[PDB]
Amino acid sequence: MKKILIIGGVAGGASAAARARRLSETAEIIMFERGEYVSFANCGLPYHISGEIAQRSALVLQTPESFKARFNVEVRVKHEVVAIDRAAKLVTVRRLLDGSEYQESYDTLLLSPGAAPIVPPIPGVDNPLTHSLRNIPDMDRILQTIQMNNVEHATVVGGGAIGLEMMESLHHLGIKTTLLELADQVMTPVDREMAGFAHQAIRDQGVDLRLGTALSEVSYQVQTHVASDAAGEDTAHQHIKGHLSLTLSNGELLETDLLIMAIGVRPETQLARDAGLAIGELGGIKVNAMMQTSDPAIYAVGDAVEEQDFVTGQACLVPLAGPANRQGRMAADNMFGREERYQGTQGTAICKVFDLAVGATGKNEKQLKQAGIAFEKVYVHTASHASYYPGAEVVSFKLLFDPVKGTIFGAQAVGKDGIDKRIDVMAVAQRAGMTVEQLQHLELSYAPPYGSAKDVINQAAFVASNIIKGDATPIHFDQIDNLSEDQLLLDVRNPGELQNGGLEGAVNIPVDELRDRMHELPKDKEIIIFCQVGLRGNVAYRQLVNNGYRARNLIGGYRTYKFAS
Amino acid sequence: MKKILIIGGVAGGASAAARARRLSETAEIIMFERGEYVSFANCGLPYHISGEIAQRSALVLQTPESFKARFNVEVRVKHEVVAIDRAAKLVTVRRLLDGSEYQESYDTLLLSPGAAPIVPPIPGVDNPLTHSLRNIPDMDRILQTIQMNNVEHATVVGGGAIGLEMMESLHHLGIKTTLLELADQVMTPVDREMAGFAHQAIRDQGVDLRLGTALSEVSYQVQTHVASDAAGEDTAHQHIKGHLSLTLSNGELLETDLLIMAIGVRPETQLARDAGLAIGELGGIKVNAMMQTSDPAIYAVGDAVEEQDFVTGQACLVPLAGPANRQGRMAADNMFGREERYQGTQGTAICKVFDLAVGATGKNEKQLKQAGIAFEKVYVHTASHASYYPGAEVVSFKLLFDPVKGTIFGAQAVGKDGIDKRIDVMAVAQRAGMTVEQLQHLELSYAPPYGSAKDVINQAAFVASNIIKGDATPIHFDQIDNLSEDQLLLDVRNPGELQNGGLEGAVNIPVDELRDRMHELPKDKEIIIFCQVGLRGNVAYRQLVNNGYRARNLIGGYRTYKFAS
Ligand SMILES: Cc1cc2nc3c(=O)[nH]c(=O)nc-3n(C[C@H](O)[C@H](O)[C@H](O)COP(=O)(O)OP(=O)(O)OC[C@H]3O[C@@H](n4cnc5c(N)ncnc54)[C@H](O)[C@@H]3O)c2cc1C
Ligand SMILES: Cc1cc2nc3c(=O)[nH]c(=O)nc-3n(C[C@H](O)[C@H](O)[C@H](O)COP(=O)(O)OP(=O)(O)OC[C@H]3O[C@@H](n4cnc5c(N)ncnc54)[C@H](O)[C@@H]3O)c2cc1C
Ligand SMILES: CC(C)(COP(=O)(O)OP(=O)(O)OC[C@H]1O[C@@H](n2cnc3c(N)ncnc32)[C@H](O)[C@@H]1OP(=O)(O)O)[C@@H](O)C(=O)NCCC(=O)NCCS
């Protein structure tokens, strides 16, 4: 008889519980959830706030009763594990129903307590109109503030996934919104210049997006005056649970009816610390690949643990459900001695942003610099599917790689269509240990409504490869504004295109006239070339080097550049 | 240097021509096209017939003038090469304008003549109302018949990609349609049971689909009576260009106003065989992986060539655009001494079939049997994105692999959403040398509107891996109709579900009562178990196997079976 206890019952816990039963009928499995529900859809919580997900029943995927009938698993909801005593092999559990305590023994334990929303050390942030979100009750309070407080302006603080989803939900309920982010961009998985497409989509919606800004102080003011129709006032724009006055880092003031805290999460480490299990350097539970804590009888998985980055091998914190689920299943496997190892996290992510999807995998420009890994990068802006078929959208896609060995570091993609497709192709490409030169040979699905003759992945591949082979020579969006005196700027777009934006003092010879007009450019200068998106630019660059000019081509074009400003 | 001549100016030829200019400014490049257009969107022809692609001009991606201005290649249209003299390094060209001919010399030559539609030996089939579709003029003739013959009922012969697309396209135009296939399914790249979903969708549209049946005779009879409004006749349903009477293999007659011939294509090999170039067993031109014919001064690419199958090493013929383009570019590379090698063809295909996409990569069940390769197969019916978010669609997915080594042979998917994504993923993966155990560790992009905690692929991976390791034991749809009295048929769906189809004689114990009701099943028989989709069945299987019963799970459940006839 194995006795297995499971702490937390969502992505990690519950995935383990089901797998453990599939692997043993003799085992005793008890799952502690401190809240009311297990197997809930944390990811959809904002989609219910918007009504996009209509019925809340949709957010609960298993029940203590379903888990007993299917899997002979005892779920105890409203039981919080309050200590582990390892030597003894006992947990101490409290029943939140009434504050009483008991202990339960175990052969093996799994910890899957998740991560709690960060509360920032900000004066008066704890008030009745300020909420975080990690579970249904957190959601209900948000919901209850919107109805009770008649919310008409709301402020989200945090430009990661949750905060962007929250901002979009509130917009959908027709509430004016301000999003604030300390950083210079939303969605840090992508790089700033990629974020740019998201930035315009947000502004274009009438959202008031403040980047590079902090919340300094929150003053909460109770409402002492109830307007009434009896008294000839207007009750429409009243806020009966009160009001918030925010102070920003720049001294400015924001008047709002509701404030959502989405600045990220920090591992539930308290149980582990108290029990003397090792915590890594990032504040997350240390685990090996198996995935044991420093006690071999105790495993841990999910948002609570530090795991290995796929690319670098360094520890990293990645609160994502897919790894949590798959870790949790693997942990079951190892409880029955299967000795399976988890293969690192690429940090594959995606987020919806109104009409856009922003996603990424692997490593970004930020993270590669700050680890002193030399890299190069490429940009393409190619149609999601064959341009001659209607409904093509521009996929803007960055690929980061080893300029010499060809290694795939990261990729990112923003667009209206086919973004998830491209981040997955990449995530498998990079996990499989493909290199950019091999990407060239990918053979993906082309019918006019689903793809193209050469897919963005194929075009990115050629572009990076031309650079690795010496067949192209990059210049980037951030190096073109400081130009030397032996450098000439060439715009190869048609003249009709200059009205949409350009660079000061560029010479304009359109690509289709270049061969004939080449003698207009001095061979003693280095030619710095820009199309709209990269592609014509590369035609020009080839014309020129082929005639013995030194040249460079603006990778990703005026587009990449424009959206970086 | 260098003098380069190209025969054919579309997918192969033009890719070659453009790449070649980017490599050298000094080379002469001349490209012969026998038709009037170059770089035309062959794939859009059906979609312009329907008006989905509104504009004729959208179909022409380059012109002789565009190619001269941008790439300084000399595009000679209406010039048909009629001979190659290898010894002399001379081709003979006929100007189709006046039938005059002239010789042109080359340093290296490129063959990209494409593939003609097949001419079936059918009495009477050449007539003013029957058409094949290869190019823009064929397209115009079809439109012309449609208009002038007032087509109200049309017939398509051929159930492959082009056939399905014209069947669909004529349906969008209001025309009652019939599709005929000799095989027992459309879309051969996937397997009969997978095609099943498409057949259903085609019939649901009021299309008359007749599988396993051929056209035996065509009788074309001219119209002699012009109905007149002056005569007080009804003019609504007249077809003044005449009528067709088709005799089918089963004796039956079919009356129709237009007949579209789409029974596949056969390589343009004449010029190649007249010049003594090597031809392969399948009837296309033989090349090495560098794209050289047996005359090493002569490259060949595209539809006319036999290529090296990715999975087997054997020759195949696959008429696809992606390969043709990329072959063409590499041919250009090779003409400049770069000696790059093509890396085989996966057969990656996809086709719209009304609301469905039907797609594949790799080898199908038919191809593997017929080549004596041992395989297993897994089926899965997962939602395209998290079920709790609106708009999930069932993704029916087949995985074909080696049960010992884990080699990935092929994959197929059919459904309303996300099929191109799961087929692209599989392609990358198999071409990266992944195995099924390895598919388990994929990290794809999950947010509620785009994927799931465990994607279609992750699930497929768990299923096959479980069989690889003996944690599962399959039975398949074709096997469950032939049972022995050592075997007991057990249905673990709920009683309500049996109303929608079932297997006669099965015992019903819904999975959620099975643990408590197990003793009701004799341990002296092997339990053959089915869910609707496979999932509840694999839970039941684990229960039984774990309590010492012998069991098989019907892979793909009743849904796979349902659609297998
Ligand atoms: C609003 C929101 C949107 C998200 N969107 C996405 C998305 O699109 N894609 C994606 O991949 N991920 C998304 N996530 C993240 C995903 O939810 C988490 O990565 C995943 O749920 C982590 O699973 P976990 O098992 O580590 O912890 P959790 O899901 O946090 O479950 C842990 C549980 O353990 C319980 N617990 C903690 N302490 C105790 C105790 N001592 N005793 C008993 N129980 C305890 C907690 O009550 C909690 O319910 C989102 C998360 C949120 C909050
Ligand atoms: C209706 C239709 C839909 C299709 N859809 C898809 C799809 O969805 N996805 C996909 O991957 N593929 C699709 N294809 C196939 C794709 O078009 C071909 O695989 C591709 O065009 C092959 O390129 P090629 O260069 O070998 O042949 P071609 O494109 O046929 O070009 C060859 C050219 O050479 C000319 N020529 C031939 N002989 C001579 C001569 N001897 N002298 C001078 N000139 C000559 C020909 O007229 C022809 O114009 C589709 C094809 C059709 C017809
Ligand atoms: C749902 C939940 C309980 C998982 O339980 P599960 O039964 O293991 O999950 P699934 O429905 O995905 O079942 C997968 C199993 O079905 C099997 N399978 C899937 N489809 C199959 C098919 N058609 N035929 C046969 N087997 C199939 C798989 O092999 C797998 O079993 P395995 O691990 O033994 O190999 C858990 O993931 C959960 O609590 N999730 C909700 C909460 C959450 O994930 N939150 C994160 C934020 S969104």
Ligand SMILES: CC(C)(COP(=O)(O)OP(=O)(O)OC[C@H]1O[C@@H](n2cnc3c(N)ncnc32)[C@H](O)[C@@H]1OP(=O)(O)O)[C@@H](O)C(=O)NCCC(=O)NCCS
């Ligand atoms: C269009 C056609 C003539 C080829 O022209 P092309 O210039 O070689 O191909 P593209 O327009 O895709 O451009 C490819 C080049 O742009 C480069 N590139 C693409 N995007 C870039 C970007 N934004 N920045 C820099 N370079 C870029 C690629 O590397 C490649 O150059 P390379 O081979 O020198 O490395 C040819 O593919 C064709 O005739 N198509 C129509 C026929 C057809 O495909 N149909 C059959 C059935 S649909």
